[PDB]
């Protein structure tokens, strides 16, 4: 007699992980970037760059 074409089956599980990193900003160099108080010459200065 002939043979029937078998086929398989499997169930795989997702194994979960996570990686994380971080940095930090100084309080001194904080107000130099965001704050819109710097009017005329402190927007294009060397310290802000």
């Amino acid at each position: 007699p002939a043979d029937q074409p078998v086929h398989n089956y499997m169930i795989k599980r997702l194994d979960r992980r996570s990686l994380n990193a971080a940095f930090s900003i100084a309080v001194e160099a904080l107000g130099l970037i965001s704050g819109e108080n710097l009017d005329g010459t402190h927007i294009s200065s060397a310290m802000r760059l």
Partner: peptide
């Protein structure tokens, strides 16, 4: 006034005096 190395070569208050 913050400059780079670029170069060229009232009111009436009450007080005692």
């Amino acid at each position: 006034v913050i400059a780079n190395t670029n170069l060229v070569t009232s009111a009436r208050v009450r007080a005692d005096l």
